[PDB]
Swiss-Prot record, chain A:
SMART domains: UDPG_MGDP_dh_C. This is UDP-glucose 6-dehydrogenase. InterPro entries: 6-PGluconate_DH-like_C_sf, NAD(P)-bd_dom_sf, UDP-Glc/GDP-Man, UDP-Glc/GDP-Man_DH_C, UDP-Glc/GDP-Man_DH_C_sf, UDP-Glc/GDP-Man_DH_dimer, UDP-Glc/GDP-Man_DH_N, UDPglc_DH_euk. Pathway: Nucleotide-sugar biosynthesis; UDP-alpha-D-glucuronate biosynthesis; UDP-alpha-D-glucuronate from UDP-alpha-D-glucose: step 1/1. Homohexamer. It comes from Homo sapiens. The active site is at E161, K220, C276. The gene is UGDH. Transmembrane segments: none annotated.
Swiss-Prot record, chain B:
Changing I41T: In DEE84; uncertain significance. This is UDP-glucose 6-dehydrogenase. It is linked to Developmental and epileptic encephalopathy 84: A form of epileptic encephalopathy, a heterogeneous group of severe early-onset epilepsies characterized by refractory seizures, neurodevelopmental impairment, and poor prognosis. Development is normal prior to seizure onset, after which cognitive and motor delays become apparent. DEE84 is an autosomal recessive form characterized by onset of refractory seizures in the first months of life. Detected in heart, placenta, liver, pancreas, spleen, thymus, prostate, ovary, small intestine and colon. Widely expressed. Changing P174A: In DEE84; uncertain significance. Changing I254T: In DEE84; uncertain significance. Pfam families: UDPG_MGDP_dh, UDPG_MGDP_dh_C, UDPG_MGDP_dh_N. It comes from Homo sapiens. Homohexamer.
Amino acid sequence: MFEIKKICCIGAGYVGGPTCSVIAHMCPEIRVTVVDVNESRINAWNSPTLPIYEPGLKEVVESCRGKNLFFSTNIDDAIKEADLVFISVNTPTKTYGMGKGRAADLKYIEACARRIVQNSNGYKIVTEKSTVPVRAAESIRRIFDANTKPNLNLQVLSNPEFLAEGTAIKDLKNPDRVLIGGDETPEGQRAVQALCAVYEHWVPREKILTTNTWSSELSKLAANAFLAQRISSINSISALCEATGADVEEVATAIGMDQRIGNKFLKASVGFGGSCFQKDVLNLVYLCEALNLPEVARYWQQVIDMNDYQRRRFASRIIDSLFNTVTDKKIAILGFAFKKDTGDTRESSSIYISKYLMDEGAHLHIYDPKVPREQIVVDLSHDDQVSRLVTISKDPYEACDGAHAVVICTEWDMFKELDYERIHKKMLKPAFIFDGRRVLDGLHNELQTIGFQIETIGKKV
Amino acid sequence: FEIKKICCIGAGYVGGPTCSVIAHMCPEIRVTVVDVNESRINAWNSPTLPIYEPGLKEVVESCRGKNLFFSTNIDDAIKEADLVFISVNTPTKTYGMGKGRAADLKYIEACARRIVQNSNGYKIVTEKSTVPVRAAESIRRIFDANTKPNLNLQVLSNPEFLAEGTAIKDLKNPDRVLIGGDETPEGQRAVQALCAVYEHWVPREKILTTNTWSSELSKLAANAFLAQRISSINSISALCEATGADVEEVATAIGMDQRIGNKFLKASVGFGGSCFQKDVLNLVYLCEALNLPEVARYWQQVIDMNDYQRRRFASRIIDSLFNTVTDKKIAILGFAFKKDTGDTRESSSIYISKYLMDEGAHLHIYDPKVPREQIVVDLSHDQVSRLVTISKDPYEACDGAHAVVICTEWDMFKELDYERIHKKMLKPAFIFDGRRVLDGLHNELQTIGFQIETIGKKV
Amino acid sequence: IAILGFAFKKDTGDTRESSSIYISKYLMDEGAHLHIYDPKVPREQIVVDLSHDQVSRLVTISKDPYEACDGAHAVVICTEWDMFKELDYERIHKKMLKPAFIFDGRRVLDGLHNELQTIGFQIETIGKKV
Ligand SMILES: [Cl-]
Ligand SMILES: [Cl-]
Ligand SMILES: [Cl-]
C-alpha cells in the first residue's frame, strides 16, 4: 500500500550519513534528507571533502547530492515533509546517576521524539537507526501517545545498523542481513513492509529479516556481545596457552575449522577496543540487572572482566620482565589505535597498557603512523604526569633509541617491516619485544639470534 | 618412513569406528583393535556390532578378516605395531584432588606402561581419547623412565571429533584432522607419518599439525566454545521472557552475521551429553591447578548458566502450579538429552524431573526410544518408587495431569492430539515447552484451553 | 606406596597428632595402596588412627621396610627415624616401578641426593627446589 517517497534522517553520524547516502544512490525516486543540529557536519557533507572517511563514500554522495540526497541544518522542515523519519543520534553512556558508566542516556532520542511529534502531522513512520537499549521504542511510543493530535498516526520501527567502521559502503550495498522490527499489529506490519520495500531496491528478500520491535533492539546488542565474547574466549585460552606450552594461534585455527564455530573473530590480542563492543556489553549487563536477571548479568560481565584481565596481565609481564621496576626507563609503544588502519583510539588497549606503565613511572615513547599527536595526549590525561613521562615519536626508530623494551599494541603491518637489526644496536640490554598482536609471528628465531628476548600473547616464554 | 601395522588399545565408540574406517581407506595397513574385555571383541567379530552407527556395519564387513582384526592378544598386537592408538575412556575422578571435575588418567597410565614393556625399536604412540592437557607428558615420562637400548617411542596427539550418531559420516568427510607432536626432527617425522595415513582419503588442506599441547587443548576448547554458544543464547532467552523479545527471532538475526554463524544457537532447557559439561569442568579445573582463577571462573559461567536455565525452567512450572506440586500428576515428555537417541547422559530431563520430584510430584514419564530401566536408574541416588511412573504412551502420561512438560525436541510431540489430552487433564492445564517444538501452534493450543509457556517467550 | 615412619617424631611409639596420619589419610582419599612401616609403633595403633572398612582395602602393614617398597611407585618418609638413612637404596630401586619417587618429609637424606639420583630415583624434599 503505502510507498515511501521522502526520507528524513536525524543525525549525520557515521551511521545515518552513509546509510542514507546509499539509500539515495540505490533509490533515485526517493528524496532523502539528512539533518543535524551540528552546523559543523552539515557544511562538511556539502563539501568536496566529507567529515568522515569511508572507501567509496565520496562517490556515492556526489552521485546523488543535489538530486535526491540533501544535507541540511533545517531539521523541522525535513520532518514535516518526510514519510519516513530515521532517528540516528548517538546514545552516550551515562556519566552520572543511576547506571553511571554502563547505562545508555536516552536524552537525544527523547528530544528527537518530542521534536518529531511537534513538527509533524498525518501519517509518518518513525524508525530508530541507532544502537538503543531494549524497550526504547516503548519510550518513543509513549511520548507519541501522550502527545497525540487529531489525524496523527505515528508508527515506531526498529532498524539497527550493522556496518563495520571501515567497510561501510560494502556492508550497506551487500549486507549479511537487514533487520527490521515492528509491532505485531496490522498498522505495524504495513509500516514494516513500507521500510522492507525500500531495501528491496538492492537487497534480496531472503536477506531481509522482520521481527518484533524488542527482538530487533536486542539483536544488535547481543550480536556485538557474541562477537566480543569470541575474542575474550580465545584470549582466555591465550593465557592458558602461555602456561601449558600450547599455542593460541594453533588452537584458534583448530577451533575455527569447526564449521559450527567458524574462524572469524578468533585472533587473540592484548584486548578488544572500539566504541561499540564494551559499550554495548556493559549496556546489556545493566539491562539485566535492572530486570532482576543477576545470573545473566554476571554471565556477560565476564566478557568485560576477561578483557580487562588480558590487558592487565600483558602490562604485568612487561613490568615483571623488567625486574618489577620501570621507573625512569625508556619504553617504546608501537601502535595506539584500537585496531590497524584507523586513527580511532576509542577504548584502545594501547591506552590502558600505556597507563599501567605510566603508573610505574616509565618513560614512554609512543609512535603511531595514523593517530594524531594531540589525541594521544588527551587520551592519557584525566596534565602534569603526561608532561613528565610521555614523549610522542615521529618515527618508530626514534622511539626505540635507548629503550629497554619494544611494546607493540596495534597490529599495524608496517611494524613487521621494521629494521630490528638497527633497533637492537641502540637499545639497552637486555632488549625486550612484547608482541601484543602476534604480528611478529614467524620472525621469532630471527629476532632471538639478533639478541632480543621476545614474548607474545599466547606463547610460552 | 611408512606406517604398516596399527594397534589400537580400546574398542570404544572412539577407537572402534575410527580404526574400521582407516582400514577401509588403507588396504595396505594391518589394523588390529584390541581390548581387555573379551565381551566387546566377540561382538565386533559378530554379525551384531556392540555399538550402532549408520554405515558402520558396511565399513566393518568390508575389512574384517582381511586387514581389520579384533583381538584380545594385546601384547602381540603392540609388538607388531608401528603406530599404537590409545583409545580408552578417561572417566572423571570420583574422589580426591579434583573430584567431579578432574580427569582420571589411570587407564591411560596402564596403557603407557603396557606399551613400553611389550615394545622394541621405533614406534609412534598416539592418544585418541579426550585427554586432559599435559597427559602426553605423563606418557613421555613413563617411556623415558622405562627406557631400553634401541627404543625410540614417539608420542603424538590425535583427538576424535565424532558426534555419537553420525560417526562414519564425520570420519569420511571431517571438518579437520588434528595431529599434535613434538617440535623436533624425530617428532616431525612421526607427525608426517600419521599425516600420511589420513592423506589416503583426507585432503592435506584439512589436516592441521600443531605441537602436542595445542592438540590436547584444542579438543577441550572446541567443545567449550560450542557449549558457550548454547549457554549464551540460553541467557538471552531469559532476557527475552523479561522484555517481550523472542529468542528464536534474536537467534536468527544474530546467526545471519557471517562472523558468528547460525549453528548451535537453538535455545533449550539446557544442553546435555557425555562431553560438554565433562570437558568444560575439566577445563575449569585445569585453570585452577595452573593458578589461572580468572580464566577458570570465566569458563565456569558456561556451566552455571546451564544450571540456571534448568532451575529457572523448573521453578516456572512450580510457580505456575501455585508453588505446590505434592501428589500432582505431571507428564514428562522426552527423557533423552537430545532427539533421535536413547542416550540419557546429562539429559536436562533428569534434573527437571528431579526438581519436580523434590516437590513430591507424581511424574508420568514418556520417551519413545529411551529404555524403561534407564529412567529408573537415572532418577535414584526409594524416592523413585513413590513418585515415578513410566508411561507406555504419551496419553497414559497426560491422563489426569496438571501439566505437560516437554524436555526433548522429539518430532512426534509436535503432532500430538492436544484436543484429546486437554479433556482428561486437570484444569488449569499447562504446557511447558522446553524445546520450542510447538512454535507456531500457540494460538491453536490457547483456544483449546491451554496456558502455554516456552523458552525465550514472554507469557 | 611405601610409608616409612608413623610416629609423630623419631624414637617413640607415640602417634598422637602424627603428620603421618594425615599424609596417609590424604593418600587414602585418593584410593592408594599404602604399605606402612614403623619400627616401634604397634600394628593395632596404626589401624585405630586410620579409622573413624576404608583401612582394609587400602592399608597393608609391612613387617620390614623392603616389603613396603616392593613394587611401589613412591617412598614417603614421614618420621625422621635414623635407620631410614642407612637403607640399601640400590636394592629398593631395582624392585620399584618407574618412575620411582622418594619424598623426604624430614630432610633425613640430606647429603645423599646425588647418590640416589644417579641410581635412578627422582627425589623431592621439604624446602628444596626440585
Ligand atoms: Cl609517577
Ligand atoms: Cl595380551
Ligand atoms: Cl577410595
